[PDB]
């Protein structure tokens, strides 16, 4: 976090911070 | 959560986890 | 659309209007 | 648009360009 | 938070809960 | 686009495709 900067990196919107 | 999966279901973007 | 309500009613954030 | 800036003004995430 | 609601009346998408 | 994939690359949620 914050939104656009997912924990662990990678694509924002794809994975645990999003659906996952 | 995460983004696009509201904890109480229904409409994502709609309810506690969004505005609410 | 709008944001959160894809046309045809799929999950918001999952598919071409998002990543896809 | 873009995301955060609804085209007709007002509050991002609240109104026709979001749910509405 | 939640998504779209900084919590103090500010602009969603601008500050710590977004980039920051 | 879609949401999460800004044109030109770059961070999603920052610059013209978001606020900007």
Curated annotation (Swiss-Prot), chains A, B, C, D, E, F:
Record-listed cross-link S-(2-aminovinyl)-3-methyl-D-cysteine (Thr-Cys), residues: 15-20
Residues in cross-link Beta-methyllanthionine (Cys-Thr): 1-2
Positions bearing the Beta-methyllanthionine (Thr-Cys) cross-link: 4-12, 13-18
PTM comment: Maturation of lantibiotics involves the enzymatic conversion of Thr, and Ser into dehydrated AA and the formation of thioether bonds with cysteine. The carboxy-terminal beta-methyllanthionine undergoes decarboxylation. This is followed by membrane translocation and cleavage of the modified precursor.
Modified sites of kind 2,3-didehydroalanine (Ser): 16
Bilayer-crossing regions: none
Role: Kills a number of Gram-positive bacteria. Acts at the level of cell wall biosynthesis by interfering with bacterial peptidoglycan biosynthesis. Specifically inhibits the conversion of the lipid II intermediate into polymeric nascent glycan strands by transglycosylation. May interact with the peptidoglycan precursor rather than with the enzyme.
Family: Belongs to the type B lantibiotic family.
Protein name: Lantibiotic mersacidin
The organism of origin for this protein: Bacillus sp. (strain HIL-Y85/54728)
């Amino acid at each position: 976090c914050x939104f656009x900067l997912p924990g662990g990196g990678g694509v924002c919107x794809l994975x645990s911070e999003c659906i996952x």
